[PDB]
From a paper:
As a class A GPCR, NTSR1 is activated by the endogenous peptide ligand neurotensin (NTS) and modulates dopaminergic neurotransmission and neuromodulation in the central nervous system. SBI-553 is a β-arrestin-biased allosteric activator of NTSR1 with the ability to bias NTS-occupied NTSR1 against Gq protein signaling and toward β-arrestin recruitment. Phosphorylation of NTSR1 in its C-tail by GRKs is crucial for the recruitment and activation of arrestins. NTSR1–β[name] complexes are stabilized by intermolecular interactions comprising two major interfaces: the intracellular region of NTSR1 transmembrane domain couples with the central crest of β[name], and the C-tail of NTSR1 binds to the N-lobe of β[name].
We also determined the structure of the NTSR1–β[name] complex in the absence of SBI-553 utilizing the chemically synthesized, phosphorylated NTSR1. Intriguingly, only the typical “core engagement” configuration was observed upon β[name] binding to NTSR1, with no sign of the “loop engagement”. These findings collectively imply that the uniquely observed “loop engagement” configuration of β[name] does not represent a naturally occurring phenomenon in the absence of SBI-553, but is more likely attributed to, and requires the binding of SBI-553. At the N-terminus of this extended region, a loop composed of 10 residues forms a hairpin-like structure, corresponding to the C-terminal part of ICL3. This ICL3 conformation is distinct from that observed in the SBI-553-unbound NTSR1–β[name] complex, where the C-terminal end of ICL3 makes a sharp turn at the end of TM6 and extends posterior to TM5. The overall architectures of both the SBI-553-bound and -unbound NTSR1–β[name] complexes display a high degree of similarity to those of the previously reported NTSR1–β[name] complexes.
Author numbering:
A (entry chain D): 26 to 244
B (entry chain Q): 23 to 232
C (entry chain R): 60 to 90, 99 to 129, 140 to 171, 183 to 211, 229 to 267, 299 to 382, 405 to 412
D (entry chain B): 5 to 365
The structure:
Amino acid sequence: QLVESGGGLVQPGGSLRLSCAASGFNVYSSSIHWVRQAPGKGLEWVASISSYYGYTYYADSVKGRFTISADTSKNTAYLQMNSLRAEDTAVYYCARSRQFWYSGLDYWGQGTLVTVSSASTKGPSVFPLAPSSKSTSGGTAALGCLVKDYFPEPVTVSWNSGALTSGVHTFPAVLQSSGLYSLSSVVTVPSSSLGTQTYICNVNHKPSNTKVDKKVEPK
Amino acid sequence: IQMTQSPSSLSASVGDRVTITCRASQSVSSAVAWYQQKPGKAPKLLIYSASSLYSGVPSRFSGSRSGTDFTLTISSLNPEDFATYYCQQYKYVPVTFGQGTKVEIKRTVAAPSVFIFPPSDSQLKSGTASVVCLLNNFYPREAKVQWKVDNALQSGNSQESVTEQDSKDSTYSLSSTLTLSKADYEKHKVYACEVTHQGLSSPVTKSFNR
Amino acid sequence: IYSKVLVTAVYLALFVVGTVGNTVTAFTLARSTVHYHLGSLALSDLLTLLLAMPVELYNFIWGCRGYYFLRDACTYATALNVASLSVERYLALCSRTKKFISAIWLASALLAVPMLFTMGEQNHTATVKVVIQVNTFMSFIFPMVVISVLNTIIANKLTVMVRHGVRVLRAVVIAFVVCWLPYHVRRLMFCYISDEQWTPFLYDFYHYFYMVTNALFYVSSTINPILYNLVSANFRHIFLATLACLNHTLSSNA
Amino acid sequence: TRVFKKASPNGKLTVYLGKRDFVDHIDLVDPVDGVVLVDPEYLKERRVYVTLTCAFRYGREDLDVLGLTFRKDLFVANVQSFPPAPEDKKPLTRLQERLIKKLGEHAYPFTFEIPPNLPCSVTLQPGPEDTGKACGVDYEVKAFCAENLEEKIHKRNSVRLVIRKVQYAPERPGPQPTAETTRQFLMSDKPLHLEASLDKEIYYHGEPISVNVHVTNNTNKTVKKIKISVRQYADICLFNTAQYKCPVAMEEADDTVAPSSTFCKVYTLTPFLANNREKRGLALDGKLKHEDTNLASSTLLREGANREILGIIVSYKVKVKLVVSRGGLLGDLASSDVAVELPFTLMHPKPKEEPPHREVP
């Protein structure tokens, strides 16, 4: 069982330190590999500390930026993400391939996301999508809410205080052009329900604790 | 090394054979492993040595071996098997992973709703315009939504995000934001939506006006 | 006299350098049973150098004969050990170690115990001179023959393959022979040349030749360890650094 | 499934091996199967032979004192390949059964029953300056085209494939490495009991060693430091058992035991190559190339070294030292060194597929 920590926000050119709490395994009998996965992209190898042959291999992209070590007494394989560029934002995983008879990376860690950006915490929005009866040709309603200008990925957006939990489609948080995040939310309802039991966009932001919870209204 | 998975997307339901061919740039011998990663979880080893099946995983997964191609057959395709699969080689120090092969439930084609929503009044007060076109409930996905604001494509300035498959409907939903300015909002006299999914026979005409 | 003193000082500096090299070799050998015996002989020869090269410098400037005999007997045991190591290596090419080292030290002490009482500064002597000459003759007879046999064996084994190691060993052995065997012969002559025609000129010539040969003999005692360590260049370099620190197999399926 | 095909410089001679890692089951060894594809109408009507060398590039002497690469072939076997042997009534194995049909009538097999009491491939660690041909036992399957056995073995067509007689740890451990030493220090009090023991008889490469140093120092002397060291007993049998002990892991904690007091602390330590990369002359597992390999596995054979004529017998044991204060008068120059030696076998676990998968840049 592997456990890792050290994820957070780093400025472009800063430094972050990630570690693996290898439990039940040895750093000499099992090489520890750190694997990067960008959000929505495929896996990408970063580093591998054999610690038996004393060789710490590195990716072509992150060559000298990383300094991965191995504290054998504490059974940890410490890693240093330094000089983190903007495009280095990703989720970093920990994998334990056998030192002898590699046989793939069988044991995997939880994963510590390392977002690298210059943006600070910014308040989200409670913009209600403009619903029109004429626009909704069918019975489904176009009511929804817009939540933009969010710095960190987690931004909770509940609907009708958890009542309208069947029919609300919340889109993943796309990266805003400025540098922030934006995760909208659209809920379908009856075409005649423009005023009948209007739902409430209960959005609660994690970092700024900005619980707007503003009800959406039709145009 | 550049290992590529030809089947980027596998829209197959349970009981359908799902062969994921992954061909390396050059000969990586028999050192290929395959991982299954659930949405937003950690990858799980399935096979190693390109043939050997990892202990503790179902026998539905079977890896092929060739000069550079390494297929993985599943056949059964249980709900637990509906995830993204990566092919990784360890025959060279720059370990190269595959692009990824998302496996989704096959569903009957559905025309996107294309319920375009006009810009929010409060959003207009902020100083920007964001008219999100909420196309929803389309199984085949791959909907080429075109803004066509004021008979102008305005390509590039479009924040299109598509959610994952529905838990029960197994239908994707995609929203494309206009991402404009308050001054541009007045210029955009007539916005629209031109979702072009496979289910839709022709381009949609959900005009947003102003 | 002044030129002789200057030459003696230069020889003393060279002997000090050789003793430093021997100490480095002993430190290398501290961490190879033949090499262990060679290192023990090198340490014994370094002690003998500290007791004799200063004594050689004093004699050039000028009990004491007892200290000289102790040093010379330790060096004789060391040289016998080195020649025997070379001969044993040639023969091999053609707890026990520690016990042997301890017994070698004990035997060296027993051999050194011999000439202390006979050779000494009174402020009778015929028997002392005879004993010293006999000991020197025996030491030279064993070392010269052993070195010649070892050098011939090494040259026959290595030069035919071409060697450098055999040639270096032969040159070092030739120098060590022309030092020790001439030194033993000079001692036996000075203790055996008849008093007739033994004028001051003959005595002075014998003394000068013996001083030169004794400087050369100290050099050869320090060089036997140096000759042994000359063939371990990689290990010698590592030890010096430590001291200064302080077509193709494809595959194709069936 | 997969085979290893090496070709001669001209290309006319090709050797198809099955696996370049042969397990030694102590009692028996995996036969070296394979086929040789030889051109009948293009080899100028010359018979081809297969030679399994067991070269031992070691022996007495060190640092090129009087010996330099004294190759002694501990076992060499030559079988006629181009001629289909005299009445070759032997099994062809499943490796050469499918290979022969695949290549056709121009491929002829060869089998090499390796002797039981013969060394495992254990390449001695070369020095930092040392490179190329290293020391230790190294097997080789060498197929050449020569009219007779003595035909200078033309280098243009003398294909040689390097193999190993590797050995894997037993699947049944027995006793516990428990051995105690006692010493009546200065004949003062009852002897101290150094009843050290390990945790398991067989330790795989990289797995920890639990050294349970147990001391009851009843004598007046007290220990300045306790050192537990793991030693690699490389017993090179080319000479008269020129055993070369070498410590590979050390745990010397300054923990001190008081007189008339007890002490018990597990000295967990692990041997690896990073801390022992400097130590030249170290016995490593046999290398087919300049690849990095682990420390040499504890060599074992049928009834132990029943007929070990020559070869590196690598064995491991841990040295539970006890540096005590000088007996009687203590001048800070001498120290009694009670110690205990505990044997253990450091052998790889039994693999299922082909042994090596390590990334090769």
